[PDB]
Amino acid sequence: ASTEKRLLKEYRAVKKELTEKRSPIHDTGIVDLHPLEDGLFRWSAVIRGPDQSPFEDALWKLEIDIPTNYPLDPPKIKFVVFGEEKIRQLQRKTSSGARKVCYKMPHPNVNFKTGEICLDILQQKWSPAWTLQSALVAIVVLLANPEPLSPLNIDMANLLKCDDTTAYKDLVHYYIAKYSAYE
Numbered sequence: 001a002s003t004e005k006r007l008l009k010e011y012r013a014v015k016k017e018l019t020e021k022r023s024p025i026h027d028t029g030i031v032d033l034h035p036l037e038d039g040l041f042r043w044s045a046v047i048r049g050p051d052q053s054p055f056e057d058a059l060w061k062l063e064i065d066i067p068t069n070y071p072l073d074p075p076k077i078k079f080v081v082f083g084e085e086k087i088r089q090l091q092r093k094t095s096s097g098a099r100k101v102c103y104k105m106p107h108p109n110v111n112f113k114t115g116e117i118c119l120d121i122l123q124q125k126w127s128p129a130w131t132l133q134s135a136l137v138a139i140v141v142l143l144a145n146p147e148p149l150s151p152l153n154i155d156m157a158n159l160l161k162c163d164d165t166t167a168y169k170d171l172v173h174y175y176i177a178k179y180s181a182y183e
Helices: 005-018 086-093 117-125 132-144 154-161 165-180
Strands: 031-034 044-049 059-065 078-081
Touching: 005 031, 031 086, 031 132, 059 117, 059 132, 117 132, 154 165
Parallel strands: none
Antiparallel strands: 031 044, 044 059, 059 078
């Protein structure tokens, strides 16, 4: 009812900051945001990997599901992850000057198959004062600051726990270099 009004206001707030060369939002990592289909309760977003992280200078797509009691409860958010077959089919249609996105997300707090982000991350931080923008920013932060406390990817979390930085970086670089395509 009125939750739609709030969601719309937040969306417009993000759109305003986006269509502009230097609002601060450009250094937060938010690249795009829009309704998934024709409703205000499912969203598609695009974010950039934060500077000085192994994820830097690469784009990822996100899907966001909004609860009915919003903003009493946080949004559920996942990375868009495709199968190797699909990705390779997408790569044969690509252009050498298009917008390319990586469709695999190797990260301690992300399910490598489904793309799901651990509910802990947002549940521990979220409050009714938060917005969609702050959630996106929170995920960009998460890319630079994983918490090995709540792992969905064992190998990455352990690499981090053993402080094997080089292998971590090399793995992320590998998936960025091999599993990216247009759109």
